[model samples]
Target: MNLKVKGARDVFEYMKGRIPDETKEHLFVLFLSTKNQILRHETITIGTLTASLIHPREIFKAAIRESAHSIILVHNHPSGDVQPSNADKQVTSILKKAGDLLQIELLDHVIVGNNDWFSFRDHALL
Candidate 1:
């Protein structure tokens, strides 16, 4: 995508080409400036048919390297289910805690499906 991403849906819209059409999980992180403008999007990890593995360092290293002030995490559910799994909740919590300590804010975590998305922020999960 050539345009700057302005919001969560912008990320979702951009996924048309970024995320795969079939069933494979991928974790994407959108690094943002303090103004919440998109700096860049990085694929943190690519995994199996169901889940992706992510680590705090893998996430923050880029935030530190790219001079990002905050982050928005996006990933896909190959099953066409956008519901955040228990694993997803746990991962989000871990990231939230880490972000707080690192002085980098976690804006939101989105679970994208084929035709929809689930926002942790919108659901008060973040």
Candidate 2:
């Protein structure tokens, strides 16, 4: 389904229910056009309750293949703690820098919980 997302809240509202097995950590990317309409989405990695592996190559490759102008990174926290871990911050930092170099915008990185979510952009982390 192609959904036109307006902001971080919209992204959260759209994907929260669609994500399977929210108790486990799963990382996904929402690829978007210049207009912020979703071009496609790809699951980059899945891991345990605390961590998910994400590589910049995998991220940019999907962006390149899908012809996406920007990327929104999303991941779930089964523990429902919206706090950003050191690993989360590191991953976001690396990917953001890579996105800048590749000229594909890293729009936001969202950490979703069962009942709440943390948006990097909203927190000024992006």
Candidate 3:
């Protein structure tokens, strides 16, 4: 779907039930234009419950290729807890810094659970 992102709620609605697998964690990135229009969306990695490998290098490479001005990060928790883990915070921090250097803004990181979602931006974590 070609969509313009308004906020985390918009992202959560688009991504909630679309995860390829519910038994594992899956990370996805949505590349956006300067106006917040979605340019591209891709799955970055699929991992077990306790681990999801996300490197800023891989994420920004695709964003660069897509000529994205900013990005929104989303991932699903198999345990149905939408809270951010320490690892999640670390990844967000690393990516935000990387994006700053690359001039691609990291807009938000949304964690999806079974019936709800948590937004780092909405919580002022990004």
Candidate 4:
């Protein structure tokens, strides 16, 4: 399944309250099925300095439950560094591979922070 970010406001609201850390901060992922439907949400992992650890297995766990066909990865930086971390880039690459094997399309990896955000697709980073 596939979903648009607009339909992911609830998760965003959830994170807005959780992103109050000073260091060792991180992000979350929202797996969506087709047509912008949420299958579920997961933290993936908490990171240090300004990143998080993520694995394809954890991402796929929620997707498998929702029978998702697509996914969107999201996270925020408390350091006010809204840019993508090396961890973010590496994790997304792995997620893409997992998506291919599972036949689930990895649609986007988004970094959200402050009044600014970065879209992997917008930057053609994907």
Q: Quick one: best lDDT, which candidate?
A: 3
lDDT of 4 by residue, 5-52 (tens): 563344454456555463556656676656666666666666652224
State each model's CA lDDT, in order: 0.81, 0.83, 0.86, 0.67
Flag the better candidate by TM-score, 1 or 4: 1
Better-scoring candidate (lDDT), 2 or 4 = 2
Candidate 2 structure quality by residue, lDDT tens digits, 18-115: 67887778888899998899887888777752334666887899899999999998888888897788878878888899999999989999988877
What tens digits encode model 1's per-residue C-alpha lDDT throughout 1-126? 434556568778766778854477888888888777788888877774233466788889989999999888887998899998887887788888889999898888999998999999989899
RMSD, one per candidate, in order = 2.5, 2.1, 2.0, 4.0
Highest TM-score model number = 3
- Every model's TM-score: 0.87, 0.90, 0.91, 0.76
Count of backbone clashes for each model? 0, 0, 0, 8
Name every residue pair that clashes in candidate 4: 1-33, 1-34, 1-68, 1-69, 1-70, 2-33, 2-34, 3-36
Q: Report the poorest 10 consecutive residues by lDDT, candidate 1.
A: 45-54
lDDT head-to-head 1 vs 3, winner:
3
Deviation from native of the Cα of residue 30 in model 2, angstroms: 0.6
